[PDB]
C-alpha cells in the first residue's frame, strides 16, 4: 500500500555522513534514495579501538561523484565509559585522524594525519571556511591544531593548561586560576610532534555532559586532573580571520587570530560575568588569562552564518545560551554580550545544549537538548533574531548533532542510544518544526554532516558550530 | 509541482505491522535490530568492543519470543583469519584475529546482552550458516572451510552432534578434483579435549585459508584459494530443517549435494544430487560405526542455497555457475527420504551465463510463492526473482542493487524484507517488497555487509519461513 519515494523526494539531493562511535564505522547515506552509498569499518584496517568520533567534510562540486572528509577516533579508556560490560584489559590507543575520500563507488582511506604529523587529537574536527584546512581539538590532552589539507601539515598547534588557585580538586575551577596558552613546536625528526596515541593525556577519558562535576568529585582518573581545561572545539568565524577555541571547564572561548597565530581575547560564558578577559603575552610563545573564579562550565560554541553573533552554551552551574555581538569583524576585543536564552525548564546540567545548527538565512538556530537516561532527549528551536526559545520537541535517547540541508528546508539529527539502546536519524521540516521521520541507524554517532557543495554551505556545516 | 508539500514517513512504516528486523554486518563487525513500525534501531552491538579483533559477523537465527519488543534471543557467528582479506578492502593487517565465534545474544527490551560464546565452551569454531531447529530449542551451525557441522542444545549450550565431511577426488589435479567425481566420507566426531570439548577453536581445522565467497565456488579449482587440504574440500554451507521434524538437510557446495540426516538417531540417510540431468539422489553407505560414504562418478555443477517449503513437501537446492537454476524435490513422503525425487526445475534463458546465481530464498507462509535473490558480481544490479511455488515457473524479476543477499518475510505474509551489501565497500540497504503486488515499496539505509537477516519470530509456526527451513 505505501511507497517511500514521496518521503525521500521531498529532500532533494543531499548526502548524510555519520561516524558510529562504538560501532567503529563511517557511512554516507543518500537522502534521495534511502541507500547507504558507502561505509568503512576502522577495525578492518587494524585500528583495534576505532571509536569514530567527530568529522567534517569539504566542499565538493558534485558530492555524488566524490567528496572528502576528516574523521577522528578516541582510544584507551574511552572504551569504558558507556557501561558496555567488556573484559578488554588493554584497549587500542586510538587518537587517529583519518582522511577519507568517496570516489563515487566506495570510501578510500587516504591517510592517517595523526601518524603523519604526530598529533593524536580525539575531540571536535572542523573544516576552515575556505574548505582548504581543518582543526582538531582534544579535551584530555588540551591541545588543538589547524592543518593544511593539501599538504597534510600542521599550520599551528597549542597546549592550554590550568593552574588552579585552590589545589583542592573540588575547588580547582570554582576558585579560579591561570590559564596558560603555549604555541607548540615539534620535538621529533621531520617536524613531527610527540603526541600520538595516549601520549599527553591529563585525564584518562573525555568528560561526559555535566562531567565537570565528576572531575571535581574525583570520579575521573588521570595524572593531571587539576590542570585540565577540557578543550572542545576550534570553531570558525565564517568571515575569516578568527577562530574560537572552547575550553569546557573554565567556561571560556579563546579567540585566535589565524593570520599571526596568537590568542587575542577570552570570551567568558557565564551570565553576570564580563563579556571577555584580556590575554597577556608573557613569553614569545606563551600567553595567560587570569580568572578570579569560574562561575560555570560551558560547552557548545559557534557563529551564526553571517558571523555577527557568537553563541556559547553555559551548562551545569548555569544553563543557558550566551550570545555576543561579534559584528565588528576588525577587532574581537570589542565583542560583547548582547542576549541570553533562558527557560524555566533549563537548570543545572540537564538538559545540556551541546550541539546546534543555524538556518542558512540565520533566522533560527536548532539546539540539541541532551539528558542522561531515561529522560527523552530532543531539539529546541530558537529564534535567532530575538534570542527567544520557540519550541522543544522530544526525539529519542541520547540526542547528538544537527545538520541542515543547504536549502534550509530540513534539519537532520542523530541519536545514539548511549551506545547500547535506540539509535536513529531524525529529519525535521524547518517550516513546521515537526519531525517528518526517523530512519534506522546502526550508529552511536556524536557527529553528522551533510556533504557541502560550496564554501557558503560550510557556514551551516561543521565549521562554524559543532 | 514536484515539491508541493512535506511528507511524513508514518504511513510507510504503519503498513508493515509490529515486526523487528535483525541483521549482522559482515565487515562492519556489528549486529542490530530495527523496529519496522517506527524506523528506529532498537539496539546494536559491535563485536570489537568486547575484544573480538576480527568480528566478521556472518550468519544468525532468532528463537520464538512471545513478545519480541520485550525480549528475544538469537545466535550470530563470525568468521576469522584470512577471511578479512577477501573482499578487496586494502587493509595492511598482517595477523588477523582468529575469529570463528558463536555468540548468544539476548535483547532485553532496551539493549543487547552478550550472554555467551558457544564456540569457546564447546571448542567448535564454525563460521557459516546458523539455523534454528523447528521447535526453537536448538540450532545448527556449519562451516565451509573446515567442512564440519553441529547441532546444539540452546538450554545447555551443549553439542548434540558434530560431523566432518571430507572429499577424496578421483582426479588429484585441482582443476578436475570435483568434475571427475570422488567419494564423500561423513564422520560422526567425538570431542577430544577435557570438558567434552572439541578441538576446532579459531582457524583450527581449516582445509582452505578463507571461505569460498558468494559466486566463487569454482575459485578453488582455479588455484585462487590457498589451503593445506584444497582438493578435500566440500564447502559445507547449511543444515536446513524439515519443518515437519526428524530430518535436516546438509548442503555441500562443491559436490552439489544435500545430505539428509535423521536427527533422531544422528545418521545420514540419503544424498540428494542438485544438478539438472543427474539422478534425484545417491545412496549413503555405512562403512564403520561412525562413518558413511557417498560415491560420485562426476560433479556437474556446484550448488549453494537450500530450503524446505513451509509445509515440508518441497525441497529446493540452487545449482550455480555451471548451471543456474532452482532444483525442486517432492519431499511429501515424511517417512522415508530415500523416496524423495526431483519434481521440477526452474530455469530462465536470462540465467544461461555464469551469473546470475539463484541465491537465498523465502517462501510465503501459505507456500504459494517463493522469492529468490539473483546474485551477480560487480557491476551488474542484483535482484529478486518471484517464483510460483505451485507450478514452479518464474513470475517476475526485479532489479534492487549491488550484492543482494538474504530475504525474510513478515509472518502475516505481507512483506518480504531483504538486504544488499555493496561487496563490503559500495551501496548497501534494506529493501522491502509488497507480496500482493510484488513491487518494491522502499529502501532504508543500512550500515552493513549483511549476508543474513531475520525477522524475530513469535512462534514455531513462524520459523517455517525464517532461518530454520531455508538459507
Ligand atoms: N550463504 C551465504 Se552468503
Ligand atoms: Cu563538544
Ligand atoms: Cu554529541
Ligand atoms: Cu562525543
Ligand atoms: Cu515542482
Ligand atoms: Cu550459504
Ligand atoms: Cu548471502
Ligand atoms: Cu556469506
Ligand atoms: Na603507547
Ligand atoms: Se559529543
> What Rg, from alpha-carbon coordinates, does chain B have?
21
- Does A431 lie at the interface with B, CB-CB under 8 angstroms? yes
Q: Is there a domain that residue B16 lies in?
A: no
The whole-angstrom distance between residue A62's C-alpha and the CA centroid of its chain comes to 26
* PDB resolution in Å: 1.8
Of A44, A45, A86, the CB nearest to B49: A86
What's the CA gap between A162 and B455, in Å, rounded? 54
Cβ of A355 below 6 Å from ligand 10:
no
Query: Is there a contact between B427 and A39 if contact means CB atoms under 8 Å apart?
Result: no
| Phi, psi for residue A333 in degrees, rounded to 5 | -70, -5
The answer for B223, left when phi > 0, alpha when psi is -120 to 50, beta otherwise, is left
Q: CA B199 → CA B58, B116, B129, B191, distances in Å?
A: 21, 19, 20, 7
Q: CA B426 → CA A25, A450, B214, B380, B402, distances in Å?
A: 14, 19, 16, 13, 8
User: CB count, 10 Å around CB of B264?
Assistant: 9
Smallest Cα distance from B177 to chain A, Å: 34
| Phi, psi for residue B337 in degrees, rounded to 5 | -60, -25
Number of domains in chain B: 1
Torsion of CA A344, A349, A351, A356, to 10 degrees: 110
Q: Is there a domain that residue B294 lies in?
A: yes
CA-nearest residue of chain B to A77? B49
Evaluate whether A405 touches A436 at the Cβ level (below 8 Å): no
Cell numbers placing A200 = 599527553
The answer for B382, left when phi > 0, alpha when psi is -120 to 50, beta otherwise, is beta
Beta bridge partners of B432: B417, B442
How would you class B209 by CB atoms within 10 Å of its CB: exposed for 0-12, middle for 13-18, buried for 19 or more?
middle
Smallest Cα distance from B44 to chain A, Å: 6
What's the CA gap between A208 and A211, in Å, rounded? 5
Q: Is there a domain that residue B14 lies in?
A: no
Smallest Cα distance from A430 to chain B, Å: 10
B451 CA → ligand 1 middle, Å? 6
How does DSSP assign B57-120, residue by residue? EEEEEE---S-TTT-EEEEEEEE-GGGGGSS------SS------EEEEEE-SS-EEEEEEHHH
* B224 Cβ neighbours under 8 A, 6+ residues apart: none
Evaluate whether B301 touches B320 at the Cβ level (below 8 Å): yes
Q: Is the dihedral of CA A228, A232, A233, A237 positive or negative?
A: negative
Cβ of A446 below 6 Å from ligand 10:
yes
SS3 A113: helix
Q: Which residue matches cell numbers 556437474?
A: B300
Q: Is there a domain that residue A235 lies in?
A: yes
Q: What is the CATH number of the domain that holds B102?
A: 2.130.10.10
Look at residues B264, B261, B299, B262 and name the one whose alpha carbon lies nearest to residue B278: B299
Cβ of B471 below 6 Å from ligand 1:
yes
Query: Is there a contact between B427 and A38 if contact means CB atoms under 8 Å apart?
Result: yes
Q: Which residue matches cell numbers 518475510?
A: B409
SS3 A114: helix
Which residues have beta carbons under 5 A from ligand 2 (an ion)? A 232
Q: CA A421 → CA A53, A311, A417, A444, B45, distances in Å?
A: 18, 31, 4, 9, 10
Q: Is there a domain that residue B9 lies in?
A: no
Q: List the end-to-end C-alpha distance of chain A, in Å, as a whole number.
A: 40
Look at residues A448, A465, A132 and name the one whose alpha carbon lies nearest to residue A307: A465
- Tallying the residues shown for chain A, one arrives at 466
SS3 B452: coil
Cell numbers placing B63 = 528463537
Of A3, A46, A85, the CB nearest to B92: A46
Which residues have beta carbons under 5 A from ligand 6 (an ion)? B 237, 471
Q: Is there a domain that residue B10 lies in?
A: no
SS3 B279: coil
SS3 A377: strand
Look at residues A164, A339, A180 and name the one whose alpha carbon lies nearest to residue A254: A180
A249 CA → ligand 1 middle, Å? 52
Evaluate whether A172 touches A216 at the Cβ level (below 8 Å): yes
> What Rg, from alpha-carbon coordinates, does chain A have?
20
* Protein residue with its CA nearest to atom 1 in ligand 10: A446
Q: Is there a domain that residue B356 lies in?
A: yes
> Whole domain around residue B110: which residue ranges?
22-465
Q: Which residue matches cell numbers 538450554?
A: B155
What's the CA gap between A111 and B30, in Å, rounded? 25
- Spell out the alpha helix ranges (H) of B320-367: none
Evaluate whether B141 touches B128 at the Cβ level (below 8 Å): yes
Look at residues B378, B324, B326 and name the one whose alpha carbon lies nearest to residue B355: B324
Cα within 13 Å of Cα(A265), Cβ side = 16
- Does B84 lie at the interface with A, CB-CB under 8 angstroms? yes
Q: Is there a domain that residue A74 lies in?
A: yes
The whole-angstrom distance between residue A424's C-alpha and the CA centroid of its chain comes to 19
∠ at Cα A421 (A417, A425), nearest 5°? 50
Instruction: State the method.
Output: X-ray
SS3 B427: coil
Amino acid at each position: 500500500t505505501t511507497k517511500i519515494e514521496e518521503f525521500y523526494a521531498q529532500f532533494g539531493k543531499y548526502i548524510l555522513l555519520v561516524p558510529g562511535k562504538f560501532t567503529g564505522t563511517v557511512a554516507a547515506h543518500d537522502l534521495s534514495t534511502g541507500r547507504t552509498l558507502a561505509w568503512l569499518a576502522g577495525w578492518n584496517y587494524g585500528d583495534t579501538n576505532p571509536i569514530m568520533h567527530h568529522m567534517a567534510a569539504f566542499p565538493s562540486p558534485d558530492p555524488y561523484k566524490g567528496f572528502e572528509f576528516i574523521v577522528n577516533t578516541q582510544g584507551g579508556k574511552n572504551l569504558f565509559i558507556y557501561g558496555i560490560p567488556t573484559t578488554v584489559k588493554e584497549p587500542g590507543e586510538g587518537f587517529n585522524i583519518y582522511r577519507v575520500r568517496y570516489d563515487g563507488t566506495k570510501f578510500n582511506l587516504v591517510s592517517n594525519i595523526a601518524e603523519k604529523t604526530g598529533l593524536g587529537l580525539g575531540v571536535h574536527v572542523t573544516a576552515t571556511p575556505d574548505g582548504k584546512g581543518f582543526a582538531v581539538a582534544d579535551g584530555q590532552k588540551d591541545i588543538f591544531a589547524e592543518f593544511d589539507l593539501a599538504t597534510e601539515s600542521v599550520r599551528t598547534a597549542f597546549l592550554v593548561d590550568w593552574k588552579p588557585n585552590n589545589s583542592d580538586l573540588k575547588r580547582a575551577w570554582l576558585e579560579g586560576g591561570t590559564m596558560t596558552i603555549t604555541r607548540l613546536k615539534p620535538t621529533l625528526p621531520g617536524g613531527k610532534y610527540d603526541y600520538t596515541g595516549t601520549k599527553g593525556c591529563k585525564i584518562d577519558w573525555e568528560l561526559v555532559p555535566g562531567g565537570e562535576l565528576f572531575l571535581e568529585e574525583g570520579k575521573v582518573t588521570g595524572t593531571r586532573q587539576t590542570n585540565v581545561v577540557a578543550l572542545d572545539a576550534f570553531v570558525y568565524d565564517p568571515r575569516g580571520r578568527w577562530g574560537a577555541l572552547s575550553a569546557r571547564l573554565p567556561g571560556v572561548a579563546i579567540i585566535f587570530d589565524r593570520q599571526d597565530w596568537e590568542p587575542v581575547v577570552a570570551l567568558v560564558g557565564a551570565k553576570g560575568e564580563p563579556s571577555s578577559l584580556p590575554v597577556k603575552k608573557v613569553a614569545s610563545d606563551t600567553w595567560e588569562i587570569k580568572m578570579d573564579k569560574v562561575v560555570t562550565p560551558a560547552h557548545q560554541a559557534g557563529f551564526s552564518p553571517d558571523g555577527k553573533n557568537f553563541l556559547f552554551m553555559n551548562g551545569v552551574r548555569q544553563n543557558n545560551i550566551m550570545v555576543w555581538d561579534t559584528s565588528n569583524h576588525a577587532d574581537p576585543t570589542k565583542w560583547t554580550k548582547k542576549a541570553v536564552v533562558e527557560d524555566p525548564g533549563w537548570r543545572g546540567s540537564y538538559p545540556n545544549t551541546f550541539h546546534m545548527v543555524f538556518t542558512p538565512d540565520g533566522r533560527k538556530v536548532y539546539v540539541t537538548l541532551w539528558w542522561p537516561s531515561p529522560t527523552p532527549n530532543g531539539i529546541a528551536v530558537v529564534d535567532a533574531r530575538n534570542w527567544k526559545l520557540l519550541k522543544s520537541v522530544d526525539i529519542g535517547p541520547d540526542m547528538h548533532t544537527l545538520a541542515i540541508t543547504y536549502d534550509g528546508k530540513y534539519v537532520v539529527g542523530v541519536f545514539s542510544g548511549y551506545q547500547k539502546t535506540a539509535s536513529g536519524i531524525v529529519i525535521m521540516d524547518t517550516k513546521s518544526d515537526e519531525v517528518v521521520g526517523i530512519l534506522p541507524s546502526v550508529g552511536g554517532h556524536h557527529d553528522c554532516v551533510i556533504v557541502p557543495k560550496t564554501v557558503e554551505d560550510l557556514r551551516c556545516s561543521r565549521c562554524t558550530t559543532t
